[PDB]
């Protein structure tokens, strides 16, 4: 139930914070939806954590590929600072985010 299965034109915007896509609704029309990832993803000791917040505050080199790799997955990458102050390049698959009738929802 990844949003990506029923959405298109997904991009990361707003300083690395916001996922934007066009999301198909029950009628088969396409609705523009944004979701601020900083409301739902944190940085826990240098790792992405769903249900956390404000990952961007302790991140560098934030970027997104909507259809990455052989699996064509929506992969968000960043260098995250751990609690010892060291950066590690990390990745998280955004397929936890759903498309609920035209809206991106965690």
Swiss-Prot record:
Keywords: Lectin. GO terms for molecular function: carbohydrate binding. Belongs to the cyanovirin-N family. Mannose-binding lectin. This is Cyanovirin-N homolog. It comes from Neurospora crassa (strain ATCC 24698 / 74-OR23-1A / CBS 708.71 / DSM 1257 / FGSC 987). The chain holds residues 42 to 95 of 111 of the full protein.
């Amino acid at each position: 139930m990844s949003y990506a299965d029923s959405s298109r034109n997904a991009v990361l915007t707003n300083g690395g914070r916001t996922l934007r896509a066009e999301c198909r609704n029950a009628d088969g029309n396409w609705v523009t939806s944004e979701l601020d990832l900083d409301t739902i993803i944190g940085n826990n000791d240098g790792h992405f954590q769903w249900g956390g917040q404000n990952f961007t505050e302790t991140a560098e080199d934030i970027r997104f590929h909507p259809k990455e790799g052989a699996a064509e997955q929506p992969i968000l990458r960043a260098r995250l600072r751990d609690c010892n102050g060291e950066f590690h390049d990390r990745d998280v698959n955004l397929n936890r985010i759903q498309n609920v009738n035209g809206r991106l929802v965690f």
